[PDB]
Amino acid sequence: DTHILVFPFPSQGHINPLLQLSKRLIAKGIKVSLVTTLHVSNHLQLQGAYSNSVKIEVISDGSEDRLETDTMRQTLDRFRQKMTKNLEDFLQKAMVSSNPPKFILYDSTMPWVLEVAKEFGLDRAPFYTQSCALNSINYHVLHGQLKLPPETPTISLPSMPLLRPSDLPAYDFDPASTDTIIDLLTSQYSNIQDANLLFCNTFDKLEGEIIQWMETLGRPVKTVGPTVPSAYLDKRVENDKHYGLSLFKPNEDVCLKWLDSKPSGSVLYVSYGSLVEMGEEQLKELALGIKETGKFFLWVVRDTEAEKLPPNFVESVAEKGLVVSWCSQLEVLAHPSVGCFFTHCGWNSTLEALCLGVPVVAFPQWADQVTNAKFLEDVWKVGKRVKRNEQRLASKEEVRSCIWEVMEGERASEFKSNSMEWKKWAKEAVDEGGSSDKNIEEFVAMLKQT
């Protein structure tokens, strides 16, 4: 039996994609051990009950954890030194055991894993959990064809759409972290020469040209996405309705009953992200913009954010708006009453919109979200970006008009038509003989050749 290690970066947004790939691998008979920290194993129940369940390997004592006093460098230098020793310690034992691991698949955000694999003579592959488009951008920043301040008003990278400065990741919301973030991002492409493969959380129909460009860098590139549960795609992995490894523990939901009573394709599902902190002025323009559409909306917004809503807002939308602390985004997006998705354009939510065939109103906030929004609007053509002002503030009218344009406007039919197509192609890719299934089959066969 073939054994591999999967080593995600310990942050929500990064763990899910690897857990999901780990499920496709165990479904093809690979034994998977998940290498992770004391902190992640305490807050997630990763241990399934079965013979083929992912084995959880805690390799840290918690002393590598982020302190709230830390400057980003401090958090990263410490994480690296301690986790480097932890992995080395783990491999010193694992590699001389009964059936040692034949591979380590690690989040591309931890390129120092490659150096450890190299010392132990262990086959290794980084996993790029965000768009291939952002692999092009960061590679070009690394090799100098692109600067941290864009040197021109239009950027034409090879095999890419034209990008403006406002289409490029904005990592500068904390002008103290920006350089640290960019060096960490650009450092994921420096040591690829020694990578067995480069895994990408995308699919060939979505980013084909960019993936073909990446293949020119000299290593085999395997598209294995989207990492969305099987029950919403090919449905070949029994019970796969959630991101996690252990048996799904349903919350008590009010959202689906509410959606059941609204017309087919009628309601705007609103989520500007579980991690985004939105200022009160923008929050109010967003709220009144949604209200000024007169459409049914379901808005999921956590209590610390909900606190910042205009005092009488929730009461004023008693008829049309359901504003709640939690729903299952996957179950909401899959619901026939949901016609449009107002999103922050995080890669994970972007893949879910594409997979579940829901047109978007793109309200990107930080980082790769701006580039994800550019592709959703101009490349995949499944909706529109809220126009924002010089101040970056999106007015209530620009929120209202954008929602109306996507849901009711001239290109409304086109957005839905294109979303149904991307839903088909996404399912195709992960279904038997799909571009992604074939990359996973190929990988599994290679592993079996030890």
Curated annotation (Swiss-Prot):
Changing T75Y: In UGTMG1; increases catalytic efficiency more than 10000-fold for the 3-OH glycosylation of mogrol, and acquired ability to convert the generated mogroside I-E to mogroside II-E via 24-OH glycosylation. Pathway: Secondary metabolite biosynthesis; terpenoid biosynthesis. Highly expressed in young fruits 15 days after anthesis (15-DAA). It catalyses: mogrol + UDP-alpha-D-glucose = mogroside IE + UDP + H(+). An anthocyanidin binds at H14, H140, A367. The keyword 4Fe-4S does not apply. Changing D107A: Loss of catalytic activity. The active site is at H14 (proton acceptor), D107 (charge relay). It comes from the Eukaryota. Keywords: Disulfide bond, Glycosyltransferase, Transferase. It holds the Pfam family UDPGT. Its EC number is 2.4.1.350. InterPro entries: UDP_glucos_trans, UDP_glycos_trans_CS. Optimum pH is 7. UDP-glycosyltransferase involved in the biosynthesis of cucurbitacin and mogroside tetracyclic triterpene natural products (e.g. siamenoside I and mogrosides IV, V and VI). Cucurbitacins have cytotoxic properties and exhibit deterrent taste as a defense barrier against herbivores. Mogrosides are nonsugar highly oxygenated compounds used as high-intensity zero-calorie sweeteners; they also possess pharmacological properties such as regulating immunity, lowering blood sugar and lipid levels, protecting the liver, and acting as antioxidants and antitumor agents. This is Mogroside I-E synthase. It comes from Siraitia grosvenorii (Monk's fruit). The gene is UGT74AC1.
